[PDB]
């Protein structure tokens, strides 16, 4: 399930869309998936 | 071949600066060849009229 959700996200993020990542202040920046995947598809 | 930007220091066996200089070199090559061909074409007889 979770892997499936990631799969959709990844595909969508890939193509050159303007990706809007958010991050809760409590979580460390490195720790959050949003920014981590944003850096995965956008170095 | 396709490359992604996970490591912007080295791609292929070539450095990042050598790669950039290679891109500029290929562009200059193609534009030069086109320019000479189009000069000869503009000097051809078919362009007289």
């Amino acid at each position: 399930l979770k892997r499936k959700i990631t799969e959709l996200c990844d595909k969508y993020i890939r193509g050159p869309n303007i990706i809007l990542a958010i991050s809760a202040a409590d979580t460390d920046l490195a720790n959050s998936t949003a920014l981590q995947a944003s850096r995965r598809v956008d170095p | 071949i396709i490359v992604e930007g996970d490591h912007p220091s080295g791609a292929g066996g070539f450095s990042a600066a050598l790669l950039a200089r290679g891109r500029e070199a290929v562009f200059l090559r193609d534009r030069a060849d086109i320019l000479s061909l189009r000069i000869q074409a503009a000097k051809s007889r078919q362009c007289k009229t």
Side-chain angles (χ1 to χ4, degrees):
Chain A
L1 339 188
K2 255 64 293 330
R3 158 105 201 314
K4 248 315 225 32
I5 295 193
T6 37
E7 170 57 346
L8 108 73
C9 255
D10 178 356
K11 248 222 113 184
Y12 256 119
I13 323 192
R14 228 168 339 172
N17 290 313
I18 167 65
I19 149 181
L20 216 193
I22 39 267
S23 297
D26 320 5
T27 299
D28 247 300
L29 300 204
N31 245 32
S32 164
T33 33
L35 279 178
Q36 194 172 359
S38 110
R39 299 174 59 200
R40 173 206 305 162
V41 297
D42 187 7
Chain B
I1 181 62
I2 65 105
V3 68
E4 104 291 358
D6 303 5
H7 32 273
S9 64
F14 300 87
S15 53
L18 246 179
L19 276 188
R21 273 149 106 174
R23 307 195 311 263
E24 190 178 0
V26 178
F27 169 66
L28 292 176
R29 168 173 64 85
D30 295 0
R31 176 67 63 95
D33 296 335
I34 294 175
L35 274 172
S36 48
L37 299 186
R38 248 316 138 180
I39 295 176
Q40 182 179 329
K43 301 184 71 196
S44 163
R45 166 142 292 119
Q46 86 160 137
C47 285
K48 173 182 175 180
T49 178

